[PDB]
Structures are given as structure tokens and as C-alpha cells.
Design a protein around this motif. Structure first.
Motif, mmCIF file in Angstrom:
data_model
loop_
_atom_site.group_PDB
_atom_site.id
_atom_site.type_symbol
_atom_site.label_atom_id
_atom_site.label_comp_id
_atom_site.label_asym_id
_atom_site.label_seq_id
_atom_site.Cartn_x
_atom_site.Cartn_y
_atom_site.Cartn_z
ATOM 1 N N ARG A 170 1.944 -9.795 -0.467
ATOM 2 C CA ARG A 170 1.846 -9.266 0.884
ATOM 3 C C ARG A 170 1.481 -7.794 0.862
ATOM 4 N NH1 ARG A 170 5.989 -11.901 5.351
ATOM 5 N NH2 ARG A 170 6.332 -13.850 4.205
ATOM 6 N N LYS A 171 2.125 -7.015 -0.006
ATOM 7 C CA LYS A 171 1.788 -5.600 -0.074
ATOM 8 C C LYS A 171 0.329 -5.406 -0.456
ATOM 9 C CE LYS A 171 5.967 -2.912 -0.790
ATOM 10 N NZ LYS A 171 6.728 -2.090 -1.768
ATOM 11 N N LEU A 172 -0.159 -6.168 -1.437
ATOM 12 C CA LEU A 172 -1.541 -6.004 -1.870
ATOM 13 C C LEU A 172 -2.512 -6.346 -0.751
ATOM 14 C CD1 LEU A 172 -1.773 -7.381 -5.501
ATOM 15 C CD2 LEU A 172 -1.792 -5.028 -4.745
ATOM 16 N N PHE A 173 -2.368 -7.531 -0.160
ATOM 17 C CA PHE A 173 -3.367 -7.990 0.798
ATOM 18 C C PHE A 173 -3.304 -7.199 2.095
ATOM 19 C CE2 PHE A 173 -5.965 -11.652 -0.226
ATOM 20 C CZ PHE A 173 -5.497 -11.990 -1.467
ATOM 21 N N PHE A 174 -2.108 -6.800 2.521
ATOM 22 C CA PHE A 174 -1.981 -6.136 3.813
ATOM 23 C C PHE A 174 -2.285 -4.650 3.699
ATOM 24 C CE2 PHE A 174 0.940 -9.183 6.287
ATOM 25 C CZ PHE A 174 0.216 -10.247 5.823
ATOM 26 N N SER A 175 -1.571 -3.981 2.924
ATOM 27 C CA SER A 175 -1.698 -2.537 2.933
ATOM 28 C C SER A 175 -2.951 -2.098 2.189
ATOM 29 C CB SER A 175 -0.478 -1.896 2.286
ATOM 30 O OG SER A 175 0.710 -2.284 2.952
ATOM 31 N N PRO A 176 -3.546 -0.972 2.576
ATOM 32 C CA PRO A 176 -4.662 -0.447 1.784
ATOM 33 C C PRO A 176 -4.286 -0.246 0.338
ATOM 34 C CG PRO A 176 -4.531 0.698 3.856
ATOM 35 C CD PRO A 176 -3.321 -0.175 3.789
ATOM 36 N N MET A 230 -2.462 5.406 4.432
ATOM 37 C CA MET A 230 -1.394 5.551 3.450
ATOM 38 C C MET A 230 -1.821 6.470 2.315
ATOM 39 S SD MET A 230 0.228 1.787 3.489
ATOM 40 C CE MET A 230 1.468 1.674 2.204
ATOM 41 N N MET A 231 -2.718 7.405 2.616
ATOM 42 C CA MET A 231 -3.135 8.366 1.608
ATOM 43 C C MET A 231 -2.058 9.409 1.354
ATOM 44 S SD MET A 231 -6.584 7.856 0.792
ATOM 45 C CE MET A 231 -8.161 7.443 1.522
ATOM 46 N N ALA A 232 -1.291 9.775 2.378
ATOM 47 C CA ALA A 232 -0.320 10.848 2.245
ATOM 48 C C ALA A 232 0.844 10.615 3.189
ATOM 49 C CB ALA A 232 -0.945 12.209 2.544
ATOM 50 N N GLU A 233 1.921 11.355 2.957
ATOM 51 C CA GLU A 233 3.099 11.328 3.806
ATOM 52 C C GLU A 233 3.459 12.743 4.227
ATOM 53 O OE1 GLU A 233 6.546 8.811 2.858
ATOM 54 O OE2 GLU A 233 5.380 7.997 1.188
ATOM 55 N N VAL A 234 4.012 12.866 5.426
ATOM 56 C CA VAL A 234 4.618 14.108 5.882
ATOM 57 C C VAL A 234 6.115 13.974 5.682
ATOM 58 C CG1 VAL A 234 5.000 15.659 7.814
ATOM 59 C CG2 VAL A 234 2.799 14.566 7.527
ATOM 60 N N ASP A 235 6.671 14.796 4.800
ATOM 61 C CA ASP A 235 8.093 14.706 4.513
ATOM 62 C C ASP A 235 8.886 14.943 5.790
ATOM 63 O OD1 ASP A 235 9.704 14.542 1.775
ATOM 64 O OD2 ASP A 235 10.839 15.851 3.127
ATOM 65 N N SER A 236 9.836 14.052 6.064
ATOM 66 C CA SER A 236 10.571 14.121 7.320
ATOM 67 C C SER A 236 11.376 15.409 7.435
ATOM 68 C CB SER A 236 11.489 12.907 7.451
ATOM 69 O OG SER A 236 12.339 12.785 6.323
ATOM 70 N N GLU A 237 12.015 15.838 6.349
ATOM 71 C CA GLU A 237 12.943 16.961 6.401
ATOM 72 C C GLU A 237 12.244 18.303 6.210
ATOM 73 O OE1 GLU A 237 16.606 16.575 4.238
ATOM 74 O OE2 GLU A 237 16.502 14.384 4.227
ATOM 75 N N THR A 238 11.576 18.488 5.074
ATOM 76 C CA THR A 238 11.039 19.785 4.692
ATOM 77 C C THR A 238 9.632 20.038 5.215
ATOM 78 O OG1 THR A 238 9.986 19.099 2.620
ATOM 79 C CG2 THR A 238 12.356 19.482 2.579
ATOM 80 N N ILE A 258 0.553 14.055 -1.030
ATOM 81 C CA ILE A 258 -0.734 13.386 -1.150
ATOM 82 C C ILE A 258 -0.613 12.340 -2.244
ATOM 83 C CG2 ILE A 258 -3.124 13.657 -1.853
ATOM 84 C CD1 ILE A 258 -3.169 16.300 -0.422
ATOM 85 N N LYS A 259 -0.798 11.079 -1.881
ATOM 86 C CA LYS A 259 -0.555 9.978 -2.798
ATOM 87 C C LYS A 259 -1.751 9.758 -3.714
ATOM 88 C CE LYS A 259 3.354 8.360 -0.800
ATOM 89 N NZ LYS A 259 4.653 8.116 -1.475
ATOM 90 N N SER A 260 -1.481 9.120 -4.854
ATOM 91 C CA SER A 260 -2.516 8.934 -5.862
ATOM 92 C C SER A 260 -3.703 8.153 -5.327
ATOM 93 C CB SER A 260 -1.941 8.213 -7.076
ATOM 94 O OG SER A 260 -2.972 7.866 -7.981
ATOM 95 N N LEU A 261 -3.510 7.385 -4.257
ATOM 96 C CA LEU A 261 -4.611 6.591 -3.730
ATOM 97 C C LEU A 261 -5.773 7.467 -3.291
ATOM 98 C CD1 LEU A 261 -5.799 3.946 -2.937
ATOM 99 C CD2 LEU A 261 -4.543 4.039 -0.821
ATOM 100 N N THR A 262 -5.500 8.715 -2.911
ATOM 101 C CA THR A 262 -6.568 9.595 -2.449
ATOM 102 C C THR A 262 -7.578 9.866 -3.553
ATOM 103 O OG1 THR A 262 -5.044 10.640 -0.893
ATOM 104 C CG2 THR A 262 -7.076 11.795 -1.402
ATOM 105 N N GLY A 263 -7.120 9.912 -4.803
ATOM 106 C CA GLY A 263 -7.996 10.315 -5.886
ATOM 107 C C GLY A 263 -8.923 9.215 -6.355
ATOM 108 N N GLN A 276 -6.493 -3.557 6.047
ATOM 109 C CA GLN A 276 -7.452 -2.543 5.649
ATOM 110 C C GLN A 276 -7.557 -2.535 4.134
ATOM 111 O OE1 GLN A 276 -6.139 1.136 7.323
ATOM 112 N NE2 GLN A 276 -7.117 0.749 9.305
ATOM 113 N N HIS A 277 -8.684 -2.051 3.624
ATOM 114 C CA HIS A 277 -8.886 -2.021 2.186
ATOM 115 C C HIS A 277 -9.969 -1.016 1.842
ATOM 116 C CE1 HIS A 277 -6.139 -5.116 1.029
ATOM 117 N NE2 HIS A 277 -6.649 -5.954 1.913
ATOM 118 N N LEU A 278 -10.043 -0.669 0.563
ATOM 119 C CA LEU A 278 -11.021 0.286 0.070
ATOM 120 C C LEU A 278 -12.269 -0.450 -0.389
ATOM 121 C CD1 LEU A 278 -8.287 1.860 -0.120
ATOM 122 C CD2 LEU A 278 -9.477 3.301 -1.747
#
Lengths: 384, 50, 49
Positions: A211-217, A350-358, A363-368, B2-4
Motif C-alpha cells: 500500500r505504501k509503495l503503490f499509493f504514496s509517491p 512528500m519531498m519534505a516536512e515542516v517540523d511541527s515544533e521547531t 528535505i527527504k532523500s526522495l528530492t535527490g 502519484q508517482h515519479l
């Protein structure tokens, strides 16, 4: 004589995924295609994903329940919670109307106003409330839940006196799936997931990973011992072989991320990169991060940590170098606005997250995975 | 969902972080007519000399 | 239980491992040599018994 997963089954699986549901009355080709392989599709989805495929007389639907909900999943035409509230209230109203019953827009507005559960009343004299109602009705009409007897809802934006005659279509009954208990006994949406996975105790991990693979980028490594990623690492080869066999996708695996790529995306699919300008700046930022490995050395989890000030400085540097080629939309906007827009875009993928607290940026590895640049001849042109 | 989009399963190495791996290079079309932007039918080269 | 690892070493250069990515960098002659030297050595080694 037995069925086999073939071109038709692959096509049906893609059609099931990339739409909420398929309607016989509007998608007869797709409905027919899906139904013929429906046996094989049901078998495969049950064994590997665990999703319930609902095949009915009027529609076919795949109840895509996510492992961990993500921002991009929700109905995108909506922009505020109030839109979702009005959408749900409108559905509740349609439960009171018999199939093909006809009601006027004023009745729907009145019922929504009455039921609207917030402390703050829903009021139609405002502009924003009317716009929210129009967006809700547009999404409803998109799913053919309600048909339009001639009229015009768009005028409702600037004319509260506008009127329309609507018709409740049969699909309204089946829109929302069924819930385990008396659903009212639950107190927060998180409790729904704990139920939907109470039915999939058998090989929960494989269904989770699929499910994680097929759904999420992408699928990000939670920590050094993330069980999903450990599973993928243990069965990389057979996972790749099965996914290639059953669909267009091809698996990739890295130290800190895993995702499915697609080589020839058909018309109806959503993919990255795409036309929207914000992607261009995302690719340029990826390249800029590649270019200073010592300054942006990724931590062990593959994240790159930057504060809003540092990110804004990076965006300023990008506006200096490549800004000449950016779309005029960004070229005219201050740094902080560009930061907000770029971060929304990167959140969707899902390239990056904004930290809730700080307020720290991750920037997640997927961006590279991808980097982009202008053609060298323009860049030299930018020098001129 | 979505996908790359990618043309080939370029990598095979489970042990390298994406940053340290060789990325996939794309040609961003600059969004100014200064270089190129088309909506109506495009032109061809008529390469008779070739 | 086990796995095979191939290695190539250009003269007076550090040893490496023959991955697909490193393979594509090879030239046609190098490609053929890499592909077939192992197989014919396998045929050879089997006969040593």
C-alpha cells in the motif's frame, strides 16, 4: 480454462487506482474491461494489498484506505475545512432525498445551514461561505452524485438570490464505504485506521509495504530499524519482479527511500515532474543541494535539516541564478512567499516536512532522485 | 495516487543514499518566450541537406 | 546462502567491483571481455577436476 493476469488486467488495475470509482453510465468501456478480469483483480488485491474491491451493478470502486494519510490524498478541489464540512452535510442531506428526486438549491443551502455542526453558524450573506458552497457542489457534481437541471451555480458567487434545480442521483447511496461498529461510538479519525487494519492481521506487513509503495509517491525510512523498509530490503528482487509482472511500475530502493517509478504515464495519471512551475524550482533546488555535499551533508536518516532562514537564503540564491528563467508568477513574488509555495508543493510530493515544533525544514532523500537545469545555451543567454 | 516518472531503473544499490548517488538529469524548459514556448502548431526543419 | 562478486582491476589502478553502473562505463571490447572471460574460465575450472 482459467484466467491470467494480462494486459487487460494491468490496464484495469491502473484504471481502478487512478480514479475514485468507475461508473457504468459514463465509463462503459472501463467498466466492462474491469469486470471481465474482476476475478483476477479481486484475488490479487486481496492477497497482496488487502483492499476491498467493490463490484456493483452501477459502479466499481476500490476502497483505497491509506496506511498513513497524507495531505495530497484528500479531495483537492477543497481548500478549507469548511468545504469538507459542507460536503459532508450535503451528503447527509442527500440521504433524505429519494433517487431522482428534485430539490432546489435554496433547500440544500437551508439544510446545510441548519445541520452545520460548528459553534459558528453558517451564513450565506458572506462571500466566502457562498464560495465554499459552490466548491462543495462542484465536487459533488464531479462524482455525479447530483445532476443539474438547467441553471447556473457559478452565479451563486456574486448573486445570493441565484436559484438552481438539482436532482439526487442514485450514486449518492453508495458513495461512502461502511464502518465497523456503530460509527458514532468513535471519537477521532485515527480510531478508524486501527479498525481497518484489525481485519488484516494476516501478513499485515506485506499489505502495508504494498500500500505504501503503490499509493504514496515514496516510502521514507522512519529510522535505522523501520520494519517496512527492512521488509523491502529483504525481498527487493521478488518485489521488483512481481510489481513488474503485475503493473507498469518498476521499483527503486535507496538507503533512505523506496518508490515506484513509471516510464510511460498515460493521460489520466499524475506524475512528477509536471507542468506546474513549482516543480521547476524543486528540480533546481535538488541540483543546488547536489552541488554542495559538504554544506548539505544529509544525516544518517537521509534528511537534510535547514531552518526557515537558511531555506530562504537558498531560495534567494536560486532566484539570483535561475530566477531569470522562472515563471513570471514566482519572479514577481518576495522570498517568503516563494518559500511558502515551494514548501507546499514539496509537501504534496512528500519531498519534505515542516517540523511541527521547531519550524525546522526536513528535505527527504526522495528530492535527490531528480535534478534539473536550463539548457546551457539559455544559461549562457542568461549571462548576456 | 502519484508517482515519479523515470525512463529506466538506473540504480541497483541498496546501500547508497540518493544524494550520494548519481541523480537523473532533466532539461527544464525556461518559461520565457526568450527561449521557447508553444501552444499552436510547431515548426520543423526541412533537413534536405542531410 | 552465498552470493557471487566480480571484480575488475585496470593496470596499476585500485581494485573495484563490477556493478552494472560501472559496467556501462566499459567500452565494447571491455564489455565483451568482462562478459565472457568469467564464463569460459568457469568452463575451464570445471575441467581442472
Amino acid at each position: 480454462q482459467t484466467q491470467l493476469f494480462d494486459e487487460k488486467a494491468i490496464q484495469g488495475m491502473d484504471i481502478l487506482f487512478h480514479h475514485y470509482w468507475i461508473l457504468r453510465a459514463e465509463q462503459p468501456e472501463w467498466y466492462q474491461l474491469i469486470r471481465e478480469r474482476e476475478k483476477v483483480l479481486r484475488r490479487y488485491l486481496d492477497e497482496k494489498f488487502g483492499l476491498r474491491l467493490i463490484v456493483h451493478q452501477h459502479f466499481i470502486k476500490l476502497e483505497k484506505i491509506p496506511v498513513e494519510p497524507e495531505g495530497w490524498m484528500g479531495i483537492q478541489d477543497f481548500q478549507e475545512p469548511m468545504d469538507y464540512a459542507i460536503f459532508c452535510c450535503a451528503l447527509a442531506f442527500l440521504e433524505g432525498k429519494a433517487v431522482d428526486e428534485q430539490f432546489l438549491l435554496s433547500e440544500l443551502c437551508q439544510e446545510i445551514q441548519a445541520d452545520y455542526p460548528g459553534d459558528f453558524p453558517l451564513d450565506w450573506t458572506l462571500y466566502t461561505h457562498r464560495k465554499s458552497l459552490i466548491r462543495a457542489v462542484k465536487v459533488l457534481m464531479e462524482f455525479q452524485l447530483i445532476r443539474t437541471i438547467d441553471g447556473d451555480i457559478g452565479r451563486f458567487d456574486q448573486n445570493e438570490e441565484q436559484e438552481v434545480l438539482y436532482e439526487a442521483s442514485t450514486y449518492s447511496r453508495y458513495f461512502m464505504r461502511t464502518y465497523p461498529d456503530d460509527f458514532s461510538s468513535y471519537q477521532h479519525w485515527s480510531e478508524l485506521l486501527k479498525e481497518d487494519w484489525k481485519l488484516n492481521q494476516e501478513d499485515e506487513r506485506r499489505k502495508r509495504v504494498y500500500r505504501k509503495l503503490f499509493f504514496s509517491p515514496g516510502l521514507h525510512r522512519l529510522d535505522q530499524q523501520d520494519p517496512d523498509f527492512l521488509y523491502i530490503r529483504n525481498y527487493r528482487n521478488r518485489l521488483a519482479e512481481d510489481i513488474e509482472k503485475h503493473s507498469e511500475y518498476k521499483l527503486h530502493v535507496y538507503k533512505n527511500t523506496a518508490f515506484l517509478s513509471i516510464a510511460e504515464p498515460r493521460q489520466y495519471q499524475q506524475v512528477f515532474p509536471n507542468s506546474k512551475a513549482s516543480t521547476d524550482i524543486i528540480l533546481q533546488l535538488s541540483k543546488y543541494i547536489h552541488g554542495e555535499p559538504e554544506r548539505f551533508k544529509a544525516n544518517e536518516n537521509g534528511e537534510i535539516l535547514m531552518t526557515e532562514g537558511e531555506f530562504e537564503q537558498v531560495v534567494d540564491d536560486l532566484r539570483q541564478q535561475f530566477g531569470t528563467g522562472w515563471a513570471k508568477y514566482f519572479r514577481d513574488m518576495s522570498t517568503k512567499g516563494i518559500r511558502t509555495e515551494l514548501l507546499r508543493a514539496m509537501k504534496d510530493w512528500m519531498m519534505a516536512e515542516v517540523d511541527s515544533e521547531t519550524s525546522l525544514i526536513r528535505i527527504k532523500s526522495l528530492t535527490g532522485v531528480m535534478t534539473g537545469e536550463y539548457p546551457s545555451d539559455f544559461q549562457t543567454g542568461g549571462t548576456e | 495516487i502519484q508517482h515519479l516518472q523515470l525512463e529506466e531503473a538506473t540504480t541497483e544499490n541498496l546501500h547508497v543514499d540518493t544524494w550520494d548517488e548519481a541523480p537523473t538529469e532533466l532539461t527544464i524548459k525556461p518559461r520565457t518566450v526568450r527561449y521557447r514556448e508553444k501552444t499552436k502548431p510547431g515548426s520543423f526543419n526541412s533537413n534536405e541537406q542531410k | 546462502w552465498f552470493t557471487f562478486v566480480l571484480s575488475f582491476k585496470r593496470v596499476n589502478e585500485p581494485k573495484r567491483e563490477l556493478t552494472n553502473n560501472a559496467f556501462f562505463k566499459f567500452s565494447g571490447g571491455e564489455k565483451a571481455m568482462a562478459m565472457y572471460i568469467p564464463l569460459f574460465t568457469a568452463a575451464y575450472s570445471r575441467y581442472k577436476e
